Amino acid sequence: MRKTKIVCTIGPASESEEMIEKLINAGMNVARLNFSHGSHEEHKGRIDTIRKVAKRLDKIVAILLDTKGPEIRTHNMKDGIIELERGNEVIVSMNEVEGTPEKFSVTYENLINDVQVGSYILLDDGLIELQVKDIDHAKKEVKCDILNSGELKNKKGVNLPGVRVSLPGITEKDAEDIRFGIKENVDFIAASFVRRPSDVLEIREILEEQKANISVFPKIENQEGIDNIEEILEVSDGLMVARGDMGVEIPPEKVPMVQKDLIRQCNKLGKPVITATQMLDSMQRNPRATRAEASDVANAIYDGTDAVMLSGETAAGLYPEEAVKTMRNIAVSAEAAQDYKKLLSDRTKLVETSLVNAIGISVAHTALNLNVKAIVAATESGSTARTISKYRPHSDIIAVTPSEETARQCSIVWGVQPVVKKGRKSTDALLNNAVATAVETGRVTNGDLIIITAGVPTGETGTTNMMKIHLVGDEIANGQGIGRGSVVGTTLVAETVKDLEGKDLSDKVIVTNSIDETFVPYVEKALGLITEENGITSPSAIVGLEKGIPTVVGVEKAVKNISNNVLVTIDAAQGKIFEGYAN
Amino acid sequence: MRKTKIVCTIGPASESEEMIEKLINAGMNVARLNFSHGSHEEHKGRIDTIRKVAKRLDKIVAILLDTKGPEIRTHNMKDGIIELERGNEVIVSMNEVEGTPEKFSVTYENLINDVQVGSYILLDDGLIELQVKDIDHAKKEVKCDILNSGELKNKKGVNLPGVRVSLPGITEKDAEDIRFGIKENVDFIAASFVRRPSDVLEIREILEEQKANISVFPKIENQEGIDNIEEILEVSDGLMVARGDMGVEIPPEKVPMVQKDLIRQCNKLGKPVITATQMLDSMQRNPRATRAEASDVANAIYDGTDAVMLSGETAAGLYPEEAVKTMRNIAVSAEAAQDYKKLLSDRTKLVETSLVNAIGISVAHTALNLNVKAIVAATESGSTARTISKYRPHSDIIAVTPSEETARQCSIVWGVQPVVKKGRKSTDALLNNAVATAVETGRVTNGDLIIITAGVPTGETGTTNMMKIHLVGDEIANGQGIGRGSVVGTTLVAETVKDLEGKDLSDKVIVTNSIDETFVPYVEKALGLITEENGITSPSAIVGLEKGIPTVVGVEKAVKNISNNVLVTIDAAQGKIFEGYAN
Amino acid sequence: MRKTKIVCTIGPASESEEMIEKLINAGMNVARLNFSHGSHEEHKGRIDTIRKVAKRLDKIVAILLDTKGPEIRTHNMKDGIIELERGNEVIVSMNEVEGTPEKFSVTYENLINDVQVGSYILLDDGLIELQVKDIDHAKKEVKCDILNSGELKNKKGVNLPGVRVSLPGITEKDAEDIRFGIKENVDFIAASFVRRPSDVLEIREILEEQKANISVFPKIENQEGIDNIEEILEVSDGLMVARGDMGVEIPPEKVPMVQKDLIRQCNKLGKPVITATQMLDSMQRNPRATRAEASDVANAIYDGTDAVMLSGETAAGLYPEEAVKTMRNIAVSAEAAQDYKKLLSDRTKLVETSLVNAIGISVAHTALNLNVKAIVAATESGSTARTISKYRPHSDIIAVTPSEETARQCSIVWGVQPVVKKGRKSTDALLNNAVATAVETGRVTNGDLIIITAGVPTGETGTTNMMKIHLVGDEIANGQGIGRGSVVGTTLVAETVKDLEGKDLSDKVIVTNSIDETFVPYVEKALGLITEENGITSPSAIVGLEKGIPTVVGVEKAVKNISNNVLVTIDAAQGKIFEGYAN
Numbered sequence A, B, C: 001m002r003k004t005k006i007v008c009t010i011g012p013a014s015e016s017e018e019m020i021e022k023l024i025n026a027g028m029n030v031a032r033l034n035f036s037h038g039s040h041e042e043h044k045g046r047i048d049t050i051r052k053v054a055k056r057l058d059k060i061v062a063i064l065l066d067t068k069g070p071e072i073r074t075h076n077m078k079d080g081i082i083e084l085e086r087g088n089e090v091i092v093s094m095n096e097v098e099g100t101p102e103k104f105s106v107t108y109e110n111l112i113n114d115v116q117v118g119s120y121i122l123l124d125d126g127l128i129e130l131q132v133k134d135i136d137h138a139k140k141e142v143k144c145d146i147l148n149s150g151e152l153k154n155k156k157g158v159n160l161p162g163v164r165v166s167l168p169g170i171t172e173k174d175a176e177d178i179r180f181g182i183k184e185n186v187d188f189i190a191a192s193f194v195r196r197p198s199d200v201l202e203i204r205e206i207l208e209e210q211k212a213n214i215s216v217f218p219k220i221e222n223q224e225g226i227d228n229i230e231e232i233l234e235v236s237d238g239l240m241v242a243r244g245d246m247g248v249e250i251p252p253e254k255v256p257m258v259q260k261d262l263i264r265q266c267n268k269l270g271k272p273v274i275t276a277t278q279m280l281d282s283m284q285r286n287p288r289a290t291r292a293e294a295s296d297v298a299n300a301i302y303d304g305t306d307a308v309m310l311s312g313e314t315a316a317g318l319y320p321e322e323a324v325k326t327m328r329n330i331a332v333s334a335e336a337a338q339d340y341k342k343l344l345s346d347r348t349k350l351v352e353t354s355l356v357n358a359i360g361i362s363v364a365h366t367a368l369n370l371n372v373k374a375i376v377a378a379t380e381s382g383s384t385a386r387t388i389s390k391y392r393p394h395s396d397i398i399a400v401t402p403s404e405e406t407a408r409q410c411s412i413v414w415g416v417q418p419v420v421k422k423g424r425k426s427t428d429a430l431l432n433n434a435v436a437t438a439v440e441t442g443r444v445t446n447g448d449l450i451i452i453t454a455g456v457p458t459g460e461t462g463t464t465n466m467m468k469i470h471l472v473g474d475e476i477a478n479g480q481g482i483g484r485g486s487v488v489g490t491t492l493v494a495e496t497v498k499d500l501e502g503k504d505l506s507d508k509v510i511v512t513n514s515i516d517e518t519f520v521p522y523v524e525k526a527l528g529l530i531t532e533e534n535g536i537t538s539p540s541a542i543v544g545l546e547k548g549i550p551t552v553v554g555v556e557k558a559v560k561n562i563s564n565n566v567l568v569t570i571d572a573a574q575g576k577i578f579e580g581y582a583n
């Protein structure tokens, strides 16, 4: 009962062995490392702090590396600062220059081939917005009308409202960053400013040289990216949705509409999605989030987000532990209050109806209708855990995996609580293990229903292809059942007809040797009946069937063996009796 | 295509005749007057500024009066300010006293009978929170443990986390405020701190003395209120949901969950709901809202809100017009992007299935499936406009009302654009007027489909009970139709077989006298056919039916009358031909 | 509660004025005249016997004329009879000859161009089946292998298992027969051996010369017909399904499968279908049908048949009245036992979702969910009665028509009980008349709900386009309702608190002047409350709302006016009270 995962950006305020512990405990599933800043030294240090604290507390926490990505900057400015009037003209040169309210240079020299007359250019994350008046490839200059006035520092950023920005997929830096990732077996890479499938593939070819197995999560920041969302997922292992980055190049009024649409588009293909940035940015300074932040976090989860990220709140903020705690809270809250029936019905239409998904569909329905405590998902890679996650069932998903690393990849998918048990070969071993693993988590006990799903045989496993429904043991008594119903109720072992005379409410299941004429008045008042020995037309049997009470005759030493007063559940079909609550 | 209504709190920054115009133009449906502050003088002044600007621009804008309501305050403090340590004790006296870090009085003398040992008390809108240690009715004092430290000014407020706060429904002030309302024929009263049905009824009995007809909108600020949400609506004409007020007495983490549930519960009964407070509170100082504000506004509209309110943003803020403009924008945006099929399907299950609703259901489906441009709703009171609004159809609802005032009451319900046309007696007049009214709005023209709904006969009108589907006129030609289909296509009047020889794509509807052997090669290549005179088995008719082309034979002077090249729509059944696009 | 219509073939056993009465009374909706046999003299005689008996008993009964149709016969045989061995050869000559076990002629001389080597030919309704060995157009002879042996009389029939039998649409006889129809304003023509649209059109061109307005019902007897079922209905007013005729050319094992599919294909377009032939053919000799006949009749009605026909059973059989009685019985039985929910749901998917149908859909659902007693359908032509019938609602359809003849056309459509009331011009007249007409049938009284549907304005009526839900009057008392519910219950006018003391069950609605402290104990025990005068927060009002009892305050002289002990129904919303049961 936790479901939506929490990604936390590690920083100064959270490097310590102490605070990493307190964050794992507050509910941190995935540690983010931002390579926009900081050296490989600093990062390698934190990776070790994380790995050790994690294996001490014995919890799966994954590592995510966020590439800095390609970008467009301003070359230094005269005096450092320089101003720009609100109705004037500025020249955007492709050759480096000192800054001036007239002449002014950018690090992306090819800008001039991407824009055109009338296109907008945004300086310093949208601080001041220009607009292209004319273009001379002669001088290689872009004359622009300054629309909103304001200042301009040196190495400040520039954004081109798509505009097929023609930067490469990855920096040379990025390429170095991501080789570092491969060296530390990091679990995720969050590729920045992705916009075409190429941009992802540039990272995947690097990974395939090393046969690295890392999941690759695009960061869709601009129109080109939004537009190519299907094609990008086609080639990607997940997805991030940074809204702060995205809000620059596209209007904030339009942003949530897109956020919804992206997350939807992930869920459709079962790719995990992270909603990122601007989540609880008040909690850097304060110890409790605003209402509109609490609202936005929740609406992420209502939009369908496998996970939720924290940037500065945990990195350099004043209150890291509190921001993690409060993140988990808002999650549990706005999940508590959501209708899994609609939710499932919704995904049943949304996701495609195909041989790959057949089981995800059956499992999710079966889980909802029979109220199963846990779906134990057996995975090598994790596809089965994600095939089950994507259909969003109330039941807690449990991913039993031999691969430690695929376990960490699971830590981000929705609803999946992963465990590492060692490889069984035979389907039979797979099934019995599952049932063991589910009980040893503690989330399931003897009463509960469990759905065991996996791809078998585990060798030729492509997709998940079988399910088993399983009661977690284990009939305390049994015999010949009469009737076909079932009930729960506290026992009342009766030696005599007078051993239940002036002390009888309903709501109990009576346990005698047989039924006389003197028992038949008392039986009808009761809930159930367990007679010791007998046959199908016996006095005990006939009186049960007739009065519509579920019973079981032919129970070995029922009076001696089964205890008095203990609550029990009988099942007419099967002819089994159980310890407490059953199904 | 506007749908979600905008309520704006008038204030200093927006009293002027000029700025009221600019706000009506930015999209203001309802002017709010907050009687928490300001004198009847100031309010009467603004009511006249509003009424005049509104009738000059010829737009319906309603007036809403927000009562101040009952409250709990602190009696003055020694030196004005007084401090309270974080682990100490403070005494909450029921008898007035000067303030002290020990002794300390409240205006609600009966507080002591509502609380109990362990209950929490919040000072100055939650600034510092106390907790009840012990109670002596002897001294009539409440000893409390101060949990969070902080200062305390004089006449500051106090909140008791429900706790059946036993204040009355309305102040004596409120009673005076609301009589003022009745004197100016104000359209709404937003009763503060409502929590039981009584509290509403207290206002309704006042109104019924005057036979005032004003809609009464509870403000649900505390648990007792939330808990009684059904019973309150039973007796209320609408509902507000102030979150700022609500966030005090209940945790912000839990707030949106409740917001959703309330709005739902309104939609279920078709009571309009206003989402209020903390909407775009950044726009008081700034000219454009944040992303998390833009997100929250939208998520209001996704939750299902008939309207959206602006407090300080339009009242005393720096940027009033911009905040109204941007409100409308975020509305249009997050409506644009929402699935009216799910929406309708959702409300079809959600609202009850009853004689009163039958027609709302039929109209909403009929509207979705046939893609009707406008649902014209004929109302005396407005119940029909709300019966249609509650099922949320894409179609623009138009409320034709004889009552000017019921028109202003409509201005708040979802999707309803009201107009005042004068009373027709006969159903026939009602129908023809409607069709006229719909066209004169300009939103519908000749191609369009229209659903006309009302309660008839208009006398014994209790609930809406009839609908008519109506094509907005008006067959330009007609005759004997052959086939049963229909198409749109540009004409090609052919005098000769050679009058369409070497100049023929498909996509056209040919208009000749009859069909020869020499026409029958060209007809099959075309979209439709209109022959001048003929019978059912004619050369013209038989060749159409056979080749599967919709045609009409027997058209009076078809070659002379119907123009060439003009786009036209023919209907095989009926045997009608139309000006442009039809249905 | 009758629904499925009964067509009866008039004959010797049923010509009499006496037996025609007894058949109309047994439930005969449509009199069939078979022009396969008998002279215009005999038929004109029966048409008058029918018209007179029908207008005497004041019941609508229609007249259906069944054309003999084109056919293939054998030219006379040598000695009259002639035999054919089981493994031998016979010659099918195109030139007339005397019969012989070798040479043998047929009236359809063109047979030879339709068949081919291997095709089967059936003699004497399938008595003996031949198969084409070789063809010589030289001698114009068809050499065939005789497969099943048997005798052969003279002018006996011949069938060619489709095989595009190339006969014309109609005999010259048929053409004369159908002109006779036009002269007697007969209501239906059942065209025999139809197989293409042409075959129907041949009858429709004849009709259009006379502007006759008669409905044309194909008889689909062979594969070509089955195959062209859609295209035939496109051009036809209804459809018959003679199984006896059909069983010849196609295997009996395959017949019901086709019957189902046809009837379905009618319902899809709302064309009425008659299931014909071999219905209760045991009842010609016996007085009560077999089980398998009773089964087949019902299964017709389950397949979705607008009507059911009787051939010999009523024509020349021994027991005509009994066969009609028993037909009606089996109908009522197997309708009684059928789920209108599935049925409607079924037709909602089956029939197309279009502007023409919108109202049929709404009306059918509205009718099912609100349990309306009668759908009164106002029609000039009858399309509205059929647009409603096709969606099969439990509610009894009533067709109010100015046209006497369109009333007789209605007598065959499913569920429609037609009446002739005189033309109203205004929608208002149309509505009020309807309500009158429904009550004057007697099927609806004051409690009942009614759906009034028609195409308006009645001038430009193409398709049905409006509905009104209407309670059949008429509030006996009214006033200010409190609460929103409603109940039924017997009154108990109380003058005193003691006027209901020691004589009080629940289940009653109390009628006093006002409520004291001494009434408030008794009110909570009751069902409803009607207090004489009062306001909304009155003692009477407040005690109702609080205890959840629907009440109405402000009822003029309620104690004096409304009677004691009479059963009554109150409605909290509206604030109306009614005579007995309401809605």
Ligand SMILES: O=C1NC[C@@H](c2c[nH]c3cc(Br)ccc23)N[C@H]1c1c[nH]c2cc(Br)ccc12
Residues within 6 Å of the ligand: A348, A353, A354, A355, A357, A358, A361, A362, A365, A366, A369, A370
């Ligand atoms: O609710 C449903 N929706 C559609 C659907 C469905 C299930 N598996 C599928 C595989 C493919 Br491939 C396509 C469609 C389906 N099945 C029923 C349903 C499924 N499992 C259940 C268990 C219980 Br217990 C009760 C009801 C159901």
Ligand SMILES: O=C1NC[C@@H](c2c[nH]c3cc(Br)ccc23)N[C@H]1c1c[nH]c2cc(Br)ccc12
Residues within 6 Å of the ligand: B353, B354, B357, B358, B361, B362, B365, B366, B369, B370, C348, C353, C354, C357, C358, C359, C361, C362, C365, C366, C369, C370
């Ligand atoms: O149950 C339904 N099934 C389908 C459907 C539907 C209704 N009108 C339509 C028009 C076109 Br065009 C296409 C589809 C529909 N509507 C609902 C429903 C309709 N009218 C109702 C009255 C009551 Br009272 C309760 C429920 C319903």
